[model samples]
Target: HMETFAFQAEIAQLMSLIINTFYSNKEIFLRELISNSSDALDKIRYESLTDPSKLDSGKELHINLIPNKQDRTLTIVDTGIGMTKADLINNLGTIAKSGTKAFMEALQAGADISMIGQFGVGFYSAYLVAEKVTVITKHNDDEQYAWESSAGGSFTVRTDTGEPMGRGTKVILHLKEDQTEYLEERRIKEIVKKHSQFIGYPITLFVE
Candidate 1:
């Protein structure tokens, strides 16, 4: 089933500001996304301690980056606490409806709950270098779902049945014309080491 949700009145304004204000520091998008993945990994690991069945899905714990020159796409995959269909609807693009600086206070307070996802930092940040983004994820408690958006007025979500999905999340960013540098292996390696090197999970980049 596929459904589209319109953004809130403030979402359009918030996304425009997030895209432009964060443009100069575009590279930070990768950092923000990877950290978001790391947070998910942490959550799964933390929960598995109490409920071992969470890991029964047989998905490995790690992060992988793939770049396709032919398609001009960059993919970031993580075998972490994946999102359900509800998550796709409520979680994705949820932050843009909120204020841009909303996460600042949470960060300052060092809240133990989800922080990187505040303000949909991981979602809209992709717009800096990607024209379109496809997020395919499968959570243990829900069927696989795909969310697609171009930072527009609305987003579409549907059940994905094309391929068997493990319990995790995969984000595919369709690189913009001038943002192809993000698909460079060397550039990605440097960014991974600089920002996410200390991430508890191993991060790998696939190159052909």
Candidate 2:
């Protein structure tokens, strides 16, 4: 985990515009989140094949969507390899790409698959509708923790108070008033199919 982090001021402005105007179709949110989840699963499965020990852990690798109407919130949970506190800040707060840099270095020496699943800025798309976002994640090497942010600047991290769920991450989005259309089951399913139908993993939406 790195102690320092920053995003170019121009990059920040670009992100804001993308979040607000790029995807006028709000349904795309489900697709983006599902795609992210699939990527996480692929990463964990890839690691498991090499380490074997990763499979020994009793974490159920699955994706679950839980909507709480009372709180006007939607939660997307994934049982995959999670990130550390520093990872949370870097991944969610700024655009840091070890993948891209490695890919460029590899290209200098004739390397490919460098652009595979390259998403340096897509993660922050959640801020498009969520007034506040909460990320509950657990890394194989560290205790489970929760990261909370209002999407302006700086985020708070704290220990999970409840019994640890498993090995993975959960993103809770508190829906904004205008974004309530996403709360419908049919709407969510349509969005998923339109954007993530080709995804390799199973995507489930649980409505309550």
Best candidate according to lDDT:
1
Best by TM-score: 1
Alpha-carbon shift of residue 61 in model 2 (angstroms): 2.3
Give a tens-digit lDDT track for model 2, residues 96-149.
345334434554575332122344544556777787878888878777888876
lDDT of 1 by residue, 119-168 (tens): 55655678778888899898999988888877767888999986766788
TM-score (C-alpha) between model 1 and the true structure: 0.86
lDDT of 1 at 151: 71
- Candidate 2 weakest lDDT stretch, 10 residues: 111-120
TM-scores of the candidates in the order shown: 0.86, 0.78
Q: Could you tell me how far off, in angstroms, the CA of residue 144 lies in candidate 1 after the best superposition?
A: 0.4
For model 1, the run of ten residues with the poorest summed lDDT: 111-120
Give Cα distance to truth, residue 185, candidate 2, Å: 0.9
